[PDB]
């Protein structure tokens, strides 16, 4: 059949937890603070991703050159293969030339 037969437990979302309350504070660190820091210095996450944006192919190129040495053997083989795939896809395939 494949449809639930009772209502799931109700979800309560605390809109006034500390994380929700102080969301987006210091986004104006630059203009309000003499330009000591760019807002892109509030970004946390991957080394190859802090304050940068690109398509999949570009992201892979970047991860290869920035954390390529330090990554695991099989992971890196997977990444080298990804790049090979995407290279052919983007250069040789598609609707428009």
Partner 1 sequence: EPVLRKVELPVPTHRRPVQAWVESLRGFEQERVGLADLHPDVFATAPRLDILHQVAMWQKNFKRISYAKTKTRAEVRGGGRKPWPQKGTGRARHGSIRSPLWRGGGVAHGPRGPTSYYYMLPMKVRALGLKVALTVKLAQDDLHIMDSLELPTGDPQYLTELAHYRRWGDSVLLVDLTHEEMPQSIVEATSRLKTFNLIPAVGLNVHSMLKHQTLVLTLPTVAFLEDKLLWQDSRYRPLYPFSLPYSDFP
Q: Which stretch binds partner 1 (CB under 8 A): 5-13, 47-55, 65-73, 89-97?
A: 47-55
DSSP 3-state percent helix, strand, coil across the chain (nearest 5): 45, 0, 55
Under 8 Å CB-to-CB from 88, ≥6 apart: which residues? none
The DSSP symbol for 38 reads: -
Under 8 Å CB-to-CB from 40, ≥6 apart: which residues? 50, 51
Q: Is 42 in the site for partner 1 (CB under 8 A)?
A: yes
Q: Is 53 in the site for partner 1 (CB under 8 A)?
A: yes
Q: Which stretch binds partner 1 (CB under 8 A): 2-10, 65-73, 77-85, 89-97?
A: 77-85
Q: Is 4 in the site for partner 1 (CB under 8 A)?
A: no
Binding site for partner 1 (CB under 8 A): 16, 21-36, 39-40, 42-43, 45-46, 49, 51-54, 56, 59-60, 63, 78, 81-82, 85
């Amino acid at each position: 059949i494949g449809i639930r037969l009772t209502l799931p437990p109700p979800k309560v979302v605390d809109r006034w937890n500390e994380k929700r309350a102080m969301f987006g504070v210091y986004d104006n660190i630059g203009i309000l603070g003499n330009f000591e820091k760019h807002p892109k210095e509030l970004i946390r996450g991957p080394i190859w991703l802090r304050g940068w944006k690109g398509n999949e192919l570009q992201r892979c190129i970047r991860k290869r050159k920035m954390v390529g040495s330090r990554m695991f053997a099989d992971d890196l083989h997977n990444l080298n293969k990804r790049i090979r795939y995407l290279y052919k896809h983007f250069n040789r395939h598609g609707k428009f030339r």
